[PDB]
Amino acid sequence: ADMHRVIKRKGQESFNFGELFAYTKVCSHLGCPSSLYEQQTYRILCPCHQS
Amino acid sequence: LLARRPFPQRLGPRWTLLYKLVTTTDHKLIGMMYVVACFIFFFIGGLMALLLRTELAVPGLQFLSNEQYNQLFTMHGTVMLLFYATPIVFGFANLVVPLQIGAPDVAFPRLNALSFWLFLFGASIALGGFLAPGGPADFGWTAYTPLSNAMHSPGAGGDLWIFGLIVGGLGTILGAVNMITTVVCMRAPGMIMFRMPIFTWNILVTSVIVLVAFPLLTSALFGLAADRNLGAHVFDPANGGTMLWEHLFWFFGHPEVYIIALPFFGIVTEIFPVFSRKPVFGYTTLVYATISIGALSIAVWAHHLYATGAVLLPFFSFMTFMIAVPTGIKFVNWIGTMWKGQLTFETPMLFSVGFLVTFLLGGLTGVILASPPLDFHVTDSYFVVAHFHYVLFGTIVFATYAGVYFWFPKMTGRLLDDRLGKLHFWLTLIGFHTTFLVHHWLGAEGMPRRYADYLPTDGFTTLNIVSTIGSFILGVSMLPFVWNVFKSWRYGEPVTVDDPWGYGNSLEWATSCPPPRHNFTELPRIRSERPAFELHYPHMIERLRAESHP
Amino acid sequence: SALLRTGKQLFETSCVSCHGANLQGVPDRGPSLIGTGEAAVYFQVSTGRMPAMRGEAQAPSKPPHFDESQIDALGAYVQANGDVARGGDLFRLNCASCHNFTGKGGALSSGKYAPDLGDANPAQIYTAMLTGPQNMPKFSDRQLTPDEKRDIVAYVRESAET
Amino acid sequence: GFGPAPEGMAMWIIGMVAAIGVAMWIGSRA
Amino acid sequence: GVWLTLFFDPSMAHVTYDGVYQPLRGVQMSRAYETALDISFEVRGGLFVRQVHHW
Amino acid sequence: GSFLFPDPAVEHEALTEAAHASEHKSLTALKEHQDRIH
Amino acid sequence: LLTINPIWNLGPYKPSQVSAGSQPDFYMMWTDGLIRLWPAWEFYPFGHTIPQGVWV
Amino acid sequence: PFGSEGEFLYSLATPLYGLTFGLSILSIGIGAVLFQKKFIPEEISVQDRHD
Amino acid sequence: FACMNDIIALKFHISLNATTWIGRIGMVVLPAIVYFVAYRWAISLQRSDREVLEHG
Amino acid sequence: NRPNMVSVGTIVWLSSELMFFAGLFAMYFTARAQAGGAWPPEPTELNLALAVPVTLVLIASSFTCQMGVFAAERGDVFGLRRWYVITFLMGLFFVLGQGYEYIHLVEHGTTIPGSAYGSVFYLATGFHGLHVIGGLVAFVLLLARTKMSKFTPAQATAAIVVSYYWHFVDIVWIALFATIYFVR
Amino acid sequence: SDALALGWPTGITPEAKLNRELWIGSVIASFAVGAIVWGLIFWTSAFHRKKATDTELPRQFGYNMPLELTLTVIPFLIISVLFYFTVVVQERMMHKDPNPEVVIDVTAFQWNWKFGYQKIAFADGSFDYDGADPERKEAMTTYLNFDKIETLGTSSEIPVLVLPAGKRIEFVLNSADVIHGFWVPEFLFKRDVLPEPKANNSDNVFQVSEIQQTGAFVGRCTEMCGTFHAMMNFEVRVVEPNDFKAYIDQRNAGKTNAEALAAINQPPLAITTEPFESRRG
Ligand SMILES: CCCCCCCCCCCCCCCCCC(=O)OC[C@H](COP(=O)([O-])OCC(O)COP(=O)([O-])OC[C@@H](COC(=O)CCCCCCCCCCCCCCCCC)OC(=O)CCCCCCCCCCCCCCCCC)OC(=O)CCCCCCCCCCCCCCCCC
Ligand code: HAS
Ligand code: HAS
Ligand SMILES: CC(C)=CCC/C(C)=C/CC/C(C)=C/CC/C(C)=C\CC/C(C)=C/CC/C(C)=C\CC/C(C)=C\CC/C(C)=C/CC/C(C)=C/CC1=C(C)C(=O)c2ccccc2C1=O
Ligand code: HEC
Ligand code: HEC
Ligand code: FES
Ligand SMILES: [Cu+2]
Ligand SMILES: [Cu+2]
Ligand SMILES: [Cu+2]
Secondary structure, eight states: OOSSSOOOSSOOOOOOOOSOOOOBBBBBTTBBOOOOOOSSSSSOTTTTTTT | OOOOOSSOOOSSSSSSSSTSSSSSOOOHHHHHHHHHHHHHHHHHHHHHHHHHHHHHTTSSSOOOOOHHTTTTHHHHHHHHHHIIIIHHHHHHHEEEEETTTTTTTTTSSHHHHHHHHHHHHHHHHHHHGTTTOOOOOOSSOOOOOOSSSTSSOOSSSSSHHHHHHHHHHHHHHHHHHHHHHHHHHHHOOTTOOSOOHHHHHHHHHHHHHHHHHHHHHHHHHHHHHHHHTTOTTTTTTTTOOOTTTHHHHHHHHHHHHHHHHTHHHHHHHHHHHHHHHSSOOTHHHHHHHHHHHHHHHHTGGGGOSSSSOOOOOOHHHHHTTTTTHHHHHHHHHGGGSSSOBBBOOOOHHHHHHHHHHHHHHHHHHHHHHHHHHHHHHHBBHHHHHHHTTTHHHHHTTTTHHHHHHTSSHHHSEEOOHHHHHHHHHHHHHHHHHHHHHHHHHHHHHBBTTTTOOOOOTTTTHHHHHHHHHHHHHHHTTTTTHHHHHHHHHSSEOOOSSSSSSSSOOOOGGOOSSSOOSSSSSOOOOOOOOOOHHTTTOOGTTTTHHHSOOO | OOOOHHHHHHHHHHTTTOOOOSOSSSSOOOOOOOOOOEEEEESOOOSSSSOOOOOOHHHHHHSOSSSSHHHHHHHHHTTTOOOOOHHHHHHHHHTTTTGGGGGGGGGGSSSSSHHHTTTOOHHHHHHHHHHOOSSSSSOTTTTBOHHHHHHHHHHEEEEEEE | OOOSSSHHHHHHIITTTTHHHHHHHSSOOO | TTTSSSSSOOOOOOOOOOOOTTTSSSSOOHHHHHHHHHHHHHTTTHHHHHHHHHH | OOOOOOOOHHHHHHHHHHHHTTTHHHHHHHHHHHHHHH | OOOOOOOOTSOOOOOTOOTTOOOOOSSHHHHHHHHSSSSSOOOOOOOSOOOOOOOO | TTTTTSHHHHTTTTHHHEEEEEHHHHHHHHHHHHHHHHHSOOOOOOOOOOO | OOOOOHHHHHTTTSSSSHHHHHHHHHHHHHHHHOOOOOOOHHHHHHHHHHHHHOOO | OOOOOOHHHHHHHHHHHHHHHTTTTTHHHHHHHTSSSOOSSSSOOSSSTTTTTTOOOOOHHHHHHHHHHHHHHHHHHHHHHHHHHHHHHHHHHHHHHHHHHHHHTTTOOOSSOOOHHHHHTTTHHHHHHHHHHHHHHHHHHHHHHHHHHOOOHHHHHHHHHHHHHHHHHHHHHHHHHHHTTTTO | TTTTTTTOOOOOOHHHHHEEEEEHHHHHHHHHHHHHHHHHHHTTTOOOOOTTTTSSSOOOOOOOOOOOOOOHHHHHHHHHHGGGGGHHHHSSSOOOOSOOSOOOOOOOTTTBOOOOOOOOTTTTTOOOOOOSSSTTTTGOOOOOOSSOOOOOOTTOOOOOOEEOOSSEEEEEOOOOSOOOOOOOBTTTTOOOOOTTTTTOOOOHHHHHHHOOEEEEEOBOOOOHHHHHGGGOOOOEEEHHHHHHHHHHHHTTTOOOHHHHTTTOOSSOOSSSSOHHHHOOO
């Protein structure tokens, strides 16, 4: 239902296949595994420092 | 000769107030802390009404959400009534009641300080629900129980509402323990229970009514929080319940209205013989009138319950008409005490006249609403919201500003300004023609209260604009009052005079302004209803006895 | 029974991030299960911020939100503790304001229908009714008997399938 | 939470209160 | 702490548990974590001396 | 005395005459030491 | 009486797992609170980078 | 284990090590203060620091 | 009290987004008004010690 | 010839707590009339045993508390201490006596959720259970206060008003004993 | 006239035409009293402190005891007249006559209305529905009056209620979840609905005599329900009694209010009110 509200990265344009994505758990700041999913509004909240 | 200082000390030293505020039992200082902290809540609660009032002007739902409107007439109805109007009763009681009798202090001086700080932290819990995710109380200030449950109102902020009114609810019960036992035990030698000014009677009578109302609310809010936090079946509609709250809240609800009304009848009785130079017409008539309103206000609670199906209608109809008789006597004893004596319309007198002009429409539309056929059409409308802004705004705005302008050069020693004082009245009353007079027309034709959004096909557009233009005039009007107080607190004309208003009646106008820390240097000889008019005028004593009784 | 070794390792892999018997700080955390059991702790909360572990119409695969054996094992690990028509009408009365109209009290768009409930079944509905939901008060013990819970669950299930 | 935060809260209100409150009984005030 | 190092093995080498705590059975853990679960569980009053040492 | 029963009041006036003089001895001790310095 | 650190509830440190309450003790809590409060201020002065962790 | 029979006697193992160890020397420490407050004589000694 | 904001989020019912903005705005504002409410407290404790000497 | 301010300030306050138990009775009677088709204990049975041998202790507590307040008016600082420890240990028998009555009615009958009678019983007698525990605190804070000063008439006045609180708690329980056990 | 009643619709029932008649007899009697007191407050604006008395000569008097006895009975006699006329009107209202002639359940659920028709029996004995079933009621294990010709009224359908304009009309006022309120502004009357009104000792039901006008009138909810309390606008229509007999017979074959109102050439949606756009989303 929400595909037009997807902004791809300039380099990572075609790294998806059929409404799937693969982002790292290891977050981009001090390396805790980001795991909280937030299925209503798509947020990848991490428990260590809340990114 | 008589060496003095040119202009008195504006602000004190570096630190004469921060400590000595935390550690205080001076009722003259805790009285000035009730007053200043309530005008912090008169702006926090009052600005919420200006956010209510611009959503209603243009017939769309512009910037407030639907649920954000509903949590801005609760937190407006709570803060105005409970966090501004019930402590300003004990604001004027702590300034004046130990002075108007010959007392050095309140009876229990550490329950005067504890009654204040229960309010200041009980009030910052309830409006501390805006920090919650779900916001504060969505349900109204009445908080009807099928709306206030665990699953209908799930968020905290509704629960912080409940335990912000039992902490402040304890803060007024403990304050009414002081105000009875001060009047009972600590009068001057020669002061009897009579010959004691009517403001101390109104604080004496409403302190009885606080002990009747506020424990019954506190027992209800521990019953509602047992239903929410615990699982309970009190306030459940299969067990009585949804009319149990209708009979526990409104048994608090009307005799809390009448602890807001009566102490500010006593300020207005205090002001008329000062500015109309002749005594209270029917002094003991006002003593027997207040006791009757102090007795009738408790057995009339279900006049707020006429259209919720079945209560006993002819009991609460006729008894609700019975409050119109002594309050009608209290208007005879206000025009009558203002009648033959010569008038001067200074700003304490001006506001007590705007009390008489605007309270009348609230009292007249009160007995309009008291009969159920006239009430079955407008009982949850904007006619009701028109009603209690002519009848609260008299006692709580035109009779607190009557008292702040009257006891500012007794509690601080500075005359609060009059040119900037008459501006504040006529920015209030002209911006009060425009706000709440039109809700009488706006609500009786079909705009019920507590609506966020209405439809532009209805004829409510050209009348909500009138009630919004005027509401900002009523919001602008607080600006020449704060500027009046902020300048004339430390600047402003000094009073080296024990009575700045000339013809003061009660015992506080015989001591210096500001009084010393135990209020008195010499008590005058008390022999009549007004001590400080026999004092300062010894040649009138042959006229206070012979020229009375027409 | 459900293997508690699998339940512990599943808790550590998928729930430790927001729950150390405590609740996730971001938004609102699920919190400690109240009256923890397979019936309610097993039943997912797709609605709201919490992600949906169980996927409807899902064949066995290496990448999956949850495993039937994995779900039961974790629901068990968290739970350490140390007239069908007549039932539906009763549910509408108690939950008539929100369930009635099959809609949602919190959100008009949200519904009690199978598309809204995804991979719904009678057991999943019964379980959320028993302890209710994150924003819905629990009904078992406190309000409704087992027959009443069973009957209301059946009525909601029949209304949503049809 | 059950990690270091309610345990750290219970240090200052139980442990250091009953370690200062003892010292105010053994010691003096001057 | 002198007591608590008579029972602690500080390595990071991986070893399955196979001990006494029932949820953590067959979990790949370091030996620093298995002996920290032997102080708490398989030493008589070792959970006490461990908890005193943290307070 | 105890928390429930008193002492026979001969042993009370001896334990308060020798208690208001054992602190008065403590007061003139520092007072005659503060005047030695200054 | 008071339990302090149950290390048997959350299992061993495996880098795939996650804990919703990752907090230090109260003497090291002001260091974790300092990381959370600084805003995301990075520099990139050259081809190299300077992360948020320089401000702690 | 959690649903066992003697689980309650295990949960009172380490509290019974606490209110019997710690309350012993708390009460020895209280009794040794109350010997100092009540029997060892009060003295005020002044020592001139030669620093 | 910002390192444990996720526990403040769950138990105290405030937010997880707004507990950094009361920290990051508070990191400048709150130590500025504790300077004023303690410099004017310590001086007013001095004036309480002079009233017990002048008057008693 | 002055009317004992603290005694006036307590009985003025003690009339407020009667109105706190006015909103708790009004929850009880409206869940008995408009909800009780049968007698209100439908799955439970109120036993007068362990309810009469704990209400005969509070009545005898007022017979020993009033003998304590006779010792404050005379000057017996130790006679005041002797009859409040009797009153403390018999008030603590009421909390432990009624506290065992609640455990007998949860693991056997109606808890505070899940019963219409279960909410108007654990709050009417529940907030009386907190006005006894709140009252026994006031005996510890008074008997320990008699250990610190010379037993002035202000120490006796503080023992008058704690006695008035305990007789209030005693009379309110009679209005609870003769309401929920006899007028079932 | 119209300007003396403070913005009052002329009531469509004769039990509300008596209610507006009492209102105008009560406002004019209050504008009498409100102009007496204003005639005494603003009369003391002719009593200033003028520069004619160098000394204070105010003629101080306090106790005129033959005057408070006059101005107590006179506010008591105005009440004792205008209390008799507020028991007669509340007796003529709420008449409770046991010939119903239509019964319309309202069943105010969470944030909209659910009207339902029960037994309708004209004075001629013509239509005689007589049998809105209780079989749907016994499945709920409750009290809600379920019917067969019930109006759902979703958030965009804005439920138009249709009742004939010459007969006794009875409103059984139940509710599902929260205390709502039932107020047609032309029925100069409310009775705000309760969750379980038999257990709260509530009256639960009122009656009107007839509808002495035609057209279509607004309906609103008054006592607070929650978030979308302002959006619970129902709407009533008053078709002819001959046209109303053709309404249910077209409805009983099975249509909607958008279709059943087309057979009696009425507008299919509401005309004085509309659905709300912000609620739809
Ligand atoms: C809920 C958690 C609770 C867990 C418990 C943790 C609490 C920590 C322990 C506190 C340790 C305090 C010091 C103890 C050693 C000193 C012992 C002593 O006697 O020295 C005298 C000492 C003065 O001696 P001094 O230095 O030689 O005299 C110089 C001048 O007098 C000096 O004159 P002044 O002007 O300087 O005034 C001095 C006085 C000024 O006086 C005062 O300000 C207050 C005086 C009374 C304070 C203690 C009252 C009660 C203690 C707590 C009770 C908790 C109840 C609820 C618990 C619910 C649990 C489920 O200030 C103090 O002495 C400092 C006291 C420190 C206050 C402690 C605050 C407690 C924090 C609460 C934490 C709550 C835990 C939450 C965790 C939840 C779960 C995670 O006075 C005291 O300190 C009295 C303290 C007594 C407390 C011990 C326990 C009471 C047991 C008696 C019960 C009687 C039963 C029935 C008897 C029958 C009739 C009699
Ligand atoms: C401190 C603030 C307040 C005062 C004072 C006050 C005085 C009265 N009120 Fe009120 N009030 C009601 C009736 C009266 C009556 C009869 C009086 C009386 O004390 C007024 C006394 C009368 C006068 C001061 C005029 C005296 C002057 C003369 C000269 C006497 C002779 C004239 C007469 C006898 C007129 C009678 C003849 C006529 C023709 C009208 C009713 C009615 O059943 C409702 C329910 C509305 C509803 O359905 O929600 C109500 C609702 C409220 C609410 C809202 C509650 C809610 O949100 O639901 C508030 C806040 C409030 C405040 C206040 N109210 N009132
Ligand atoms: C004590 C009693 C009351 C006072 C005074 C009062 C004042 C006003 N009210 Fe009101 N009221 C309404 C309009 C006004 C207006 C225009 C004013 C004015 O007198 C207020 C004057 C305005 C101000 C005074 C604001 C000045 C702001 C300034 C100058 C800037 C502030 C700056 C800062 C930085 C603020 C912070 C300051 C610090 C020191 C921290 C309206 C709407 O037109 C409703 C209907 C809501 C509904 O639908 O039911 C209403 C509803 C109520 C209700 C029913 C609540 C409910 O249904 O749940 C009650 C009981 C009540 C009482 C009171 N009300 N009012
Ligand atoms: C005195 C001082 C710190 C001077 C610093 C000198 C200076 C100018 C330094 C410049 C460098 C700067 C700016 C440093 C900033 C401070 C900083 C980042 C680190 C310094 C750390 C440090 C030395 C802190 C000392 C302050 C401290 C913890 C306690 C002193 C408080 C005092 C005076 C008495 C304590 C009274 C007491 C025992 C109260 C117990 C009950 C209360 C109210 C506890 C409050 C409380 C506390 C205090 C917690 O730490 C805590 C931690 C985790 C969970 C909960 C709590 C909690 O509730
Ligand atoms: C006072 C509030 C409230 C009451 C009462 C309530 N619910 Fe709910 N219910 C909710 C909320 C809010 C949700 C959305 C799920 C969530 O909270 O995350 C919900 C969701 C549900 C769902 C899942 C729908 C979906 O698509 O996810 C079912 C099934 C359900 N409720 C059944 C019931 C039954 C059966 C009753 C009564 C017999 C009931 N509810 C009473 C608030 C309530
Ligand atoms: C093994 C069980 C289990 C795992 C793993 C789990 N949850 Fe939950 N969650 C639940 C249960 C059960 C509820 C229902 C709330 C309750 O327990 O009262 C729930 C509710 C929620 C809710 C509230 C939904 C509502 O409407 O109330 C959110 C948000 C949530 N979970 C987020 C998460 C996130 C994010 C993760 C992992 C990144 C997660 N959950 C993993 C069992 C789990
Ligand atoms: S570790 Fe800093 S963002 Fe997760
Ligand atoms: Cu009223
Ligand atoms: Cu409604
Ligand atoms: Cu509504």
